[PDB]
Write a protein that binds this ligand. Structure first.
Ligand SMILES: [Cl-]
Ligand SMILES: [Cl-]
Ligand code: NA
Length: 129
């Protein structure tokens, strides 16, 4: 499923991400835009053989099991395929664990390079939330 901007914002807000660990909703929508273009089915292979999955491009080296990333951790205790569902619950619950681990949203390279320090509130402008 490819989300619209306000649709995803409303979905993330209902799942408790607005101001989660101090990150306003616009940060999460901005990260999703540049990580996956709002597409729950996005996958990208990394140089180390791991793969990023879903709307927030969660990495199989640490966070989910895809059966082909040797020596990887499964810290969200989920198959990576569950992160590709049109229901974002699994991706959001896993993202909450990632953003709480110490580095905040700097774990998402696209957020660091394209959202951090910008007017991220623009990403929820006009949405009925
Ligand atoms: Cl915001
Ligand atoms: Cl980037
Ligand atoms: Na959903």
């Amino acid at each position: 499923k490819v989300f619209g901007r306000c649709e995803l914002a409303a979905a993330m807000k209902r799942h408790g991400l607005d101001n989660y660990r101090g990150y306003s909703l616009g940060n999460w929508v901005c990260a999703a835009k540049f990580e996956s273009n709002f597409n729950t089915q996005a996958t990208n292979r990394n140089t180390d053989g791991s793969t990023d999955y879903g709307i927030l491009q969660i990495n199989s080296r640490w966070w989910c099991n895809d059966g082909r990333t040797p020596g990887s951790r499964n810290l969200c205790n989920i198959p990576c395929s569950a992160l590709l569902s049109s229901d974002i619950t699994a991706s959001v619950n896993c993202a909450k664990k990632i953003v709480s681990d110490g580095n905040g949203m700097n774990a998402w390279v696209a957020w660091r390079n394209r959202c951090k320090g910008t007017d991220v509130q623009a990403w929820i402008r006009g949405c009925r939330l």
